[PDB]
Amino acid sequence: RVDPLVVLFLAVGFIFSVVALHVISKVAGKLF
């Protein structure tokens, strides 16, 4: 069903979301 580059994009965007969520938490802890 799923192309392999779609799997690669899903994984990289997933890990990017996990990083950016910690970054949002750290910036919100530093500012507020």
Contact residues: other proteins, CB under 8 A: 1-5, 7-16, 18-23, 25-26
Residue number, 10 or 32, with CB nearest to other proteins: 10
Cα separation, 24 vs 29, in Å, equals: 8
Cα separation, 24 vs 6, in Å, equals: 26
Residue number, 3 or 32, with CB nearest to other proteins: 3
Cα separation, 9 vs 26, in Å, equals: 25
Least Å from the CB of residue 18 to other proteins: 6
Residue number, 5 or 31, with CB nearest to other proteins: 5
